[PDB]
Amino acid sequence: KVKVGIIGGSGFDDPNLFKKVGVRQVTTPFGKPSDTLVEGFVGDVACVVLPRHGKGHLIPPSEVNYRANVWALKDLGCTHILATNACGSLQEDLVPGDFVVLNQFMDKTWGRENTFYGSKPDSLKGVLHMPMAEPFCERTRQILIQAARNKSINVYDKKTMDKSACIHPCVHAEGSAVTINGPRFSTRCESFIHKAMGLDIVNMTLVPEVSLAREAGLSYASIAIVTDFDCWKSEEEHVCVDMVLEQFRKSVVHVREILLEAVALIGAEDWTKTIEANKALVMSSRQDL
Amino acid sequence: KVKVGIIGGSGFDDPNLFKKVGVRQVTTPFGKPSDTLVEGFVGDVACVVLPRHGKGHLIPPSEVNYRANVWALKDLGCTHILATNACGSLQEDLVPGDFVVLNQFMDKTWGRENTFYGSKPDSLKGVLHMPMAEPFCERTRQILIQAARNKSINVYDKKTMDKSACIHPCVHAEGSAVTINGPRFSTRCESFIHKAMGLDIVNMTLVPEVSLAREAGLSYASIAIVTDFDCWKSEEEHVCVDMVLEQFRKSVVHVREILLEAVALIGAEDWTKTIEANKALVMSSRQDLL
């Protein structure tokens, strides 16, 4: 029994992926979600849509209640979460218009509530140390990639394909993301430092959303939308809000295609053991037990 | 017309740049500034002076209300902000006594209020994503450098001069700064890591002051005072409070000379377009309005 939650970020404040059947305003032990949750179906698969920054985009990346958002989806019966993340490219072969199915990240966030467990009154009791070597649900990752293939969107795998075979616009089959706290964009100094470390893209919204999803025993995968080259290139042109929004509008049609096709693909498989494994991993990470 | 705000940090708790014409204690949407603001004139140019840590230096770098300080300067009508920052050198050619007109930074601060905008009652409403590729006002940067030339202080530009032209004490025409949260100084491990990343100096007070200045639509430039070699050199001697204060007292006369001349140079030019551009950049970065 699968149900897919969808979290839309920058340039995707109103995903609008289906005819809305119902609307839930929920509360969690960790506070209220960013907005009301919109429910509907993709085929026979139940689906929930939630704007990360609220309908009017009034909530900045660092102030988003990631716990409430993830836990609200969990309470509504979601087994999977597909998320969108606008980003800047730190590499030549990743160009505006491309998408990246992330498989790795580096965390530079702070001051965000990043765990459901702890000793404070507003947390679940216990100490939870989750393994995060491969922080995403690999099965869900491959579904996003396969969804791109089915909708005739180019896929580039750096490990099996030459760079001359990278056909833009394309969905990159892997990549690492540095997550900064924001709300400001990076300096040129920080950009080149991130490049030197071999990172692929830079964003503000991936962490702790990906971490909390695993804590919730949910299968999570991110589709990163490349909207710019950050600021490591020429003055014409470095990243700004207008640039991010402009490119995202150009790419949003392919984003909806991939997501809708992904939800259908997830509902076409059995996830019994994977869900078992997701829950068992959480229990085995409790050190207080 | 222009009005230049001046913020003094470590070793500069009492700038004393002029005779006070007025004295102001203001409230701000983000709290109280570090201390009373001092109003006056440098020649015919209006100025406002504000110590970053208070006159008694009781407020540590991580607890300074950068929001209130910058916003207070904005409300009083400041168009520019000149700021001083004590720092340790991570490079051979930057030695104690030198100064750096920074052009870049890397942020390693945390737990500081770094933006005026958000969804909390403690902030203005909206979501602001400012560009920070070149985080300083370039025109104001060049004025600091020119001010040093006018006061017969050596100026070293690594991009146009050979290393032989690096004569100390000198003002470096460019440089990057890593801003650590403090209050402790860095370990040797951290020092060499910052050094390997290619950073020029390390400080505790630059960020988020520079970021907030741009958010407020102000032209901001920093002059960093190199007081030590951090701790990547010999045990005699590694950075400590006494070392920092000792060098800063030796360097404070050149600092005041540069600032006063810079204020005069600012008042000699027209800034209508730059100020317009600064303000328009704010509104164009409001994603909630877009």
Added chain:
Amino acid sequence: KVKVGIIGGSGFDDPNLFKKVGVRQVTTPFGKPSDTLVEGFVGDVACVVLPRHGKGHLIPPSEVNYRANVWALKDLGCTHILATNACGSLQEDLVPGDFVVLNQFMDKTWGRENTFYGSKPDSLKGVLHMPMAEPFCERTRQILIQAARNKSINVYDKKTMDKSACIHPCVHAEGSAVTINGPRFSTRCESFIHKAMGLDIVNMTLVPEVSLAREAGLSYASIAIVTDFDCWKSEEEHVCVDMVLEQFRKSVVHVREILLEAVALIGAEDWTKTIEANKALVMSSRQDL
């Protein structure tokens, strides 16, 4: 007169080093310590034991009241603190079972109270900028190392020895630690990034414990217990709670042996000048004065 406090972390919530002669529950100007402080003797040397995470390990690394723990030990009259820290290795020469007498660290923590001094009501008045070039008490470090020698445990000093002399299990005479906030473990991306920076181990509990100890004028030394290779090696296996606890159980007998000998060796020497130097360093770091 010396008094050695011992802070036990992961895999060492119950050090059990001596017969309980007394117990203190205290309230400190910065709040309550993690647990009751147990008092006794190692030979003729006064000793105090305090579990960093509480007896039931209910307090996560980021929520530990390091200020209260250190200050409570200071108020009992402790002159020294010996601490244990579970960690993952980032380098080939450091394998599970090895111990490391740390001499350096890189801080990547956030949201932790890392100083006793400030302008907030819950802090001591003043501005304290402590030198931290070599953050540990060197005399106390050498005692930990000598304690290992006394117990016929291999000691590997990479500065005076060859790579062929690195015989496992061994106590490394030096090492650098990156301290992450947790509670999650690192991603492979982060693991390789830390590795490329030349760091030896990764942990969650060293900072700000070491920093506050120096602020309090106490001699502090950490012995790190390598329980895994983090996640930069083979998929079978990467770090998890079960792996950490399993290896620590295999090492705990030797950890206790070293600590007991260390406490005795401390009490056998005169620390009058060192103690004065510890106090003087704090006073010289007050910028407000």
